[PDB]
Amino acid sequence: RIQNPILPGFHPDPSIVRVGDDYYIATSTFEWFPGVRIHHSRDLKHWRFVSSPLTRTSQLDMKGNMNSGGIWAPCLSYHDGTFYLIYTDVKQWHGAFKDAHNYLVTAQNIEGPWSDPIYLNSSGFDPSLFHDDDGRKWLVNMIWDYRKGNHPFAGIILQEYSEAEQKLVGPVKNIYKGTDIQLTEGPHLYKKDGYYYLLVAEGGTEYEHAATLARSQSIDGPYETDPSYPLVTSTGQPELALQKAGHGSLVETQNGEWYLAHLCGRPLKGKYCTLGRETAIQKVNWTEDGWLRIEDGGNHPLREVTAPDLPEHPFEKEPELDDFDAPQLHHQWNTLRIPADPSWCSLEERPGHLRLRGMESLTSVHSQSLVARRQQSFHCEVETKLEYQPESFQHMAGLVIYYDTEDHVYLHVTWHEEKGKCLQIIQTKGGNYDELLASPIPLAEEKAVYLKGRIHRETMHLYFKQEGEAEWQPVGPTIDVTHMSDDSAKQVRFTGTFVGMATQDLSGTKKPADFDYFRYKE
Template sequence: MQIANPVLPGFNADPSMIRVGDTYYIANSTFEWFPGVRLHESKDMVHWNLLPSPLSRTSQLDMRGNPSSGGIWAPDLSYADGKFWLIYTDVKVVNGAFKDCTNYLVTAESIHGPWSEPIRVNGVGFDASLFHDDDGRKYLVQQTWDFREYHHGFDGITLTEFDVKTMKLKPETERTIWRGTDVKLTEGPHLYKINGYYYLFAAEGGTVYTHQEVVARSKSLDALSFEGMPSNPFITNFDTPRSYLQKQGHGALVDTPSGEWYYASLCGRPWHHDNESFTDPRGWCTLGRETSIQKVEWTEDGWPYIVGGHGGQRYVDAPKDAIETEAPADHSQHDDFMSDTLDLNWNTLRVPFDGKMGKVGGGVLELRGQGSLCNLFDLSLVARRWQAFNFDATVKVEFDPKNYRQMAGLTNYYDDLCWSWVFVTWDERRQCRVIEVAQNDFNNYTSFLRDTAPAVPDDVKSVWLRTKVRKQWYSYEYSFDGTSWVNLGVKLDAKILSDDYILRRYGGFFTGAFVGLAAIDLSGYDRVAKFSEFDYRELPDNE
């Protein structure tokens, strides 16, 4: 078998990979999307299955009002003392000098839960991980944030002992163990003890095309005792602009039962328009930051290296002792909404799906109209990741608006700043329901069909809406019978839903594009939309 990268396509950033027995687990960042922390499992590193998220209650994660790309940054999953430990950061400020954040700890005896209520750990910096030393002591390892304008914001890697009796840190033990290289922006630390050395893996260069992972080691955990690897960086694509995978860096190291080594890293897959340079801009990652896995070997003097070079490979040999895992062939999804709980692929923004937002079951997803798609507090949106460059997504919607402030439909969404949708609303000039397409581009809002919006006949109860995404471009269609489709004539540039486009004007660019279902009622009358027969169908890449 071979690992085909990325192993977790579409917005699965900052992987924390561990092995327990013969099973591998990966935890990924979820930022402002709920539930918090995405989990997958596999026994072969090739095929991965999605698990329930560990942070499913507001008592564990309260993100209401969090800025886009705030929330869960770089969770750390570990296993020790017969249970799983999960460290996660909730970031409340994204732009500017401050990154107000709190680190929490939850535990569970089974990866499937139940997961405990959180213990507040500290707020020194984000990307915290928990290191379990072989003498039984535990340490929190974290990026350290410095808000002062005369210091670099990334102030090295801090280590603090964690007392398992009190389940609290010992602040007096806090010390900086490594400053990083001159590339700076040192973050995402993970510690490992191998053959008598403490190995520190850390990301640098920012999670963009200059991203990299570096390695340092020490015989002790004393302050500033770590020395950098002579051949750093360990992995990067800064100097491999034509590699299929880009942005590799932040990740985690794991060994197999038979002693092989692998490294899970975030990555991106940029594309270009035909009239753009291949290297500047390097491209647009509409699928966000994904997860790749590379094979690792060691030099005679005890330093790790990526097999095939630090740019990594698209295809990697699976572990020799891999146990073949059954998993879906792709990430296509059909949802008839028969269950009274949402499918694991669905996510909401900042808060869990509840009665205020709507209900599901019996073949219908009901969404109660709330705020606009720019709202950070009250929003009725249920969405799933783009996980392929080419796909069709279709849904049937029953909606009877009474004014233009009431809208319901199908959206392609990056964050509160950048999104578009096709929706049913009311046109007071023509006194009828219409189908409109609109886009929000950094709060520049455009109604494309303001003079040509198709009317919905009075005798039509439901409207089918569809989006066709074809890597660089996407469009919207409608149907009154689910069979005959009409293209609405709006061709939208997909780059507006990419990390790289958001980065140009906003400091939180860490997620990826979603396709979802939304209901809005700005008049405050809670108008309900009924969705059914959702289908997300992935198509082959044209490469």
Template sequence: MKISNPVLRGFDADPSMIRVGDTYYIANSTFEWFPGVRLHESTDLVHWKLLPSPLQSTELIDMRGNPASGGVWAPDLSYADGKFWLVYSDIKVVNGAFKDGINYLTCADQITGPWSTPIRLNGVGFDASLFHDDDGRKYLVQQTWDHREYHHAFNGITLTEFDTAMMKLKPETARTLWRGDEVKLIEGPHLYKKDGLYYLFAAEGGTVWTHREVVARSNSLEALSFEASPGNPFISNFDTPNSYLQKQGHGALVDTPSGEWYYASLCARPWHHATESATDPRGWCTLGRETSIQKVEWDEEGWPYVVGGHGGTRYVEAPVDAIVPDNAEDPALPRHIHDDFMSPTLDLEWNTLRVPFSKCMGEVGQGKLRLIGEGSLCNTFDLSLVARRWQAFNFDATTSVSFNPSTYQAMAGLTHYYNDQHWSWVYVTWDEERSCRIIEVAQNDRNHLTTYLRENAVVVPEHVQRIGLRTKVRTQTYTYEYSFDEGATWHEIPIVLDAKILSDDYVNETYGGFFTGAFVGLAAVDYSGYETVAEFTDFDYQEFEDAA
């Protein structure tokens, strides 16, 4: 049996992987998307099951108003003293000299919760992780942020002891363990102890094509006592531009019950247009940063290395002691997911922005998702949108909506969304000149809005109550369609949109927060303030390729 990378497809970045008994867990960043922190479990490192997220309420995290790609950066999951420990951030600033991020700690006896009221730790830097030493002492390990323009912003890795009696940090114990090397941008630290030595794993180079993971070690936790591995980088794709996986780096190490070792890393899979180079730049990652797993061994000098070379491989031998779940399906097969909205709660794959789905946004159940029109898709405070990740390069997504607006300021439909500056949608709205409902397509590209159909907008017949909307994503481009007869006949709207606008790499050209990925979802807008309701009766997501 082999691990097929990426094991988590579509925007599952910054993996923190642990093992408890014979079960592995991965926690991933969610940034401004709610609920906070994405969790998966596995018993074989091949098949992964999505679990309820730990940050389900605004008591645990309130991101209302957070900028795009703020919020939860690189959560750290650990297990000690018979319970799970979760360290996570809430980053309030993305661009500029500051981050204004606060790190929090919450605990739970079970991975499914309930999770405790969060403890505020510090704001020294992001990517904080908790190290449990074998003498019972605990330490927070984190990237250190320096706002001063005459210093490098990434000021090494700081270690601070955590007082378990008072459940607070001891700032007087803070010291710099390691500053990394000339590549800079050192972040994402995790500490491990093996054979009496402390091993520090950290990312460098930024989470782009130059991204990499490096290793250093020491026989103590004294300041600046760590030496770099002569085999660095531990993992990187900077010098493997033709590899299937790119951007590998930031991640976590785990051992198996039988003593094998594996490393979970973020990764990305770029595509490029036929008119573009495949290496400069390397392309567009519309699925965002995903999670891969590589096998690790240790050399005679006690340094870890990735089996097959530091570029990693697409297929990796699974653990010899893997426990394959009953009725396990090939996780690389295309997914087909249908939601008829019968449940009174949203499926785990659905996400909202910054705050939980609530009565202010609408309600779900009994075959309907009712969304109350709020702010525009540019709004970072009040927005009625539910969405799920793109998890394949080729897929169709279909819905049907009943919507009766009385103003052009009210809109509802099917959207592809990266952030508040980069999105498009097909939507139903009101045309006051023709006194009828119409279907329109619009795109927001770097906050420049283009409405495509205008006088050629599709008129919705008066007798039609439910309007079918469909999108077809085909790696480089995507289109929208509509139906007036319950999906029996579909009409393609002759607008072909470039998918690269929904990629990390495109967003990175003009904005510092490029850490998520493309989503497809349902939205209702009514910035007139009259709260026009849209009623969605189904959603279908069908992939058309082996995207693993």
């Protein structure tokens, strides 16, 4: 009944939790603002967005963060009326070192106001807070060893957290080193039937990803690993619809049913995940000897999973069109690194329109006037109507298909010394700048411009037309979009393809661009 992925599009490292009859899943967001995405469900089959906790720079300051830095795997927990969110702001991750800082924020309501952060530690990423039944709280995270001849994933560390003193206290202990799959991370503690169960991610978040379970009678170990490890993986099985199965978290329903939420990838052309890592869920059963196993007795993720015995609770479908009539941006919209600010992103300066004022280029990791949403299907259509009056080639505004500063496609309106107002397509691939039209197409100075994109798996095509025109016109060649994916760069990438609006004023005059509406249809 449950159809995976449950959270399609960029939704990695799912952290699931049940509070009464409500289920929540928090996912990583990296450089995209606001930080941490939380979805809600009542039957595990239907899901809806409920909130994004990190909305203030006092909570998350990512200006200048390199691509795929920022918010890595998060942990959402609940205890005695309060929600606990543990997160990481990664400042440096390429190279021998890992500069990552872990924080904790709280709330009484999943959407309710979230507190400013309490700093925890920086010894490694993938932090997780465990609430033991004796009232004590513990933080586990992986420890990173940057030294020359050692495996960097040096294991799982444990240290007690004092809510009273709002800081970690006491000795730190390495409680588990993982298996031969290595790259042990994503630690999560669970207490069941007298055992402390330690779920961990292994093999790297790519095609060798996995989830392995271990247990011990004491919280600090030693931990014994499930002889039948790993619990889930897609490793040497190209036939699986869901690849990269790993980094999961466990939840028990009101009926005593157990489910494993985990990330996965759906590659195009063999290995290109344009949609990034998505969230899937599996039903898992406890074995006679105290371990967990996928419902079919196997070790692989299933695309279709048996749903829990709960009343069906579907949600109202999200609108296909955003006419920008509301004073606040729809929740599906995100910005890069920094929060949207009235100075460059306004819905009140010209009601019914999203006014963006041009800032830095699409290659900047600081301040870009870009607003976009996650592509969540391999087959979709995107369209917007733009009013822009460029006066220089340094003025551009339009429709963007964006992965990062190294890979993006941009159908935009600009100015040419000979043609005046015109249309052009910029494509940056592997960090290499290019223009897909030999010469820009002249546009009528006093007409709004319609921009459209249609994506079908590995390829897409762009279209446009001006106000008084009855038919859409194709523009540029068919474009292979697989370069915008987690797998096409020198090193792994952790986000996914986004679609949206952008404008830059490289002259510095903050030229405004008015987008009348934006449509996203799968």
